[model samples]
Target chain A: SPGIWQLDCTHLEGKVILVAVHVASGYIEAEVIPAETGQETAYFLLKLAGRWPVKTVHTDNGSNFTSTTVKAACWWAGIKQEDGIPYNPQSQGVIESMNKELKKIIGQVRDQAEHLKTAVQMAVFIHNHKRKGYSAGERIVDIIATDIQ
Target chain B: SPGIWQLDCTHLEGKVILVAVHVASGYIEAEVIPAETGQETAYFLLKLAGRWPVKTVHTDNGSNFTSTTVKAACWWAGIKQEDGIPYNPQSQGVIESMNKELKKIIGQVRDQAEHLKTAVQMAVFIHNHKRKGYSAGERIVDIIATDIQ
Candidate 1:
């Protein structure tokens, strides 16, 4: 089974880019937003959780995600939240892989120089469906389940 | 006219992850390799360039890209080379858009648990087809580029 993917956004210049990933499988889902903050991020997370059964969540020390609203959502959903140490990204290693790989795919699809939002959306779509992982002993983890048993 | 994508890859451990982007459309591309460094990067660039007619090239001032072999190839192809300033990430502003947008997609696809390549590909596909953006002039730029002429 696949684990619930951790979600976050990489905000720059006042834009919120939403990303959702499954922990064990390394499978991913994503979106791009105009704002990067707690309310918007939590709103999107709620929307994403509608699609999957998100369980344990882990992320870096980003203010938006650490906000009260997001925390409440995680608690309400019965999702465990794991925050990475300050200035240490290695703790959330899997998502970093998702970050790099998705960036690469974005680089490929945006080969024609489309708009930023479009470029990001396409990257997310391709990342989720087009690419598949075939590693041995790799089991799919559910993204929204409360328990791992 | 669409420009050439100058992909740069750095090796972390025994693997290679590259960033590929198209100049005109600001499209991004990426790949993971078992190897990194000169000859291989050159080969990948040549292959990517083979897919379209590139006008100008932009990249950072790295020895790998500025190396004699890579420069010679760009020159031979009539692709003018431009380098970003040293120690300044802002110099490569275009690519950061790729980074942020890709981050969102990866977040959604990777979520908290599964976060595998499958989810990554799905996010990429969605990003390409679904997302929309506005330009500095407020004109919406769709992610999909149908014509390059």
Candidate 2:
């Protein structure tokens, strides 16, 4: 009940990219999937919850996010869902910032990898290890663990 | 001397992408560039200042940004230059946020365009017309104009 995660779907070449960011420590998780429907997105959320503590899910007011499948999945998991205002872009700043960071790191890693999956995976690793601005030169992973105690 | 801009360079395929954002108004301009050297970047700065009222340039502590040519250009233009802390990524959030927006819009437009240039230009136009979070549904360009009076 103390955790919030922002979820969004992006694309790479021809596949779907599902992105999640734990708002507390700015830790991010991104993965590639084949479908772009609500059912797939629901699965993505459940998978994240299976591994980590996911209490709330924040996303834009998109059709896939509003579909019954997604809402049902969130209800089943007891994960609260918050939808961004229809026309306002500022309400989702937290996740938006994470996406920006992720894209930069992913692009940098993409040049060295042959596929998008490898690039995304490498980017997620590099981003979590890189120094955060407000973290006194500590990385995201360290900050996450440090915040736990 | 009232304007402060954050400038950064990214890559799309093999070409350079130059991005600048007005901090006060959240208006953004992104252009595709050819060269990746300081000399070329200096020209890009001047080109932006030529049409817009740019008074200061802010950038990361990168080689191209810190090069003598870039410093010379800023000096000649009577523009103050501020360098971000090396190894710190949060200081550039303004431009970084714009980059994230530009990337999303560009990718959306890329599906319909034959070349990256067309997609980028169209995305820039679309972004400037999209509403900002704090602007009460007012588009970025309108905010820029509205802030004038």
Return the TM-scores of chain A for each candidate in numbered order.
0.68, 0.75
Model 2 residue A119 CA deviation (Å) reads 42
Q: Per-prediction DockQ scores?
A: 0.02, 0.01
lDDT for predicted candidate 1 compared with the true structure: 0.50
lDDT of 1 at A43: 52
**lDDT, candidates in the order shown:** 0.50, 0.61
Best by TM-score: 2
Taking the candidates one at a time, how many backbone clashes does each contain? 99, 0
Q: Which residue pairs in candidate 2 have backbone atoms (N, alpha carbon, C) closer than 3 angstroms, thus clashing? A: none
Write candidate 2's Cα lDDT for B1-149 as tens digits: 23677777777768878877666655556667785688666655654553344677877447855798888767645568887453456556655666777788778868754667656755655665454553311332233333343
What are the TM-scores, per candidate, against the unseen true structure? 0.40, 0.43
Q: Model 1, B105-132: lDDT tens per residue?
A: 6666566434233333344334433425
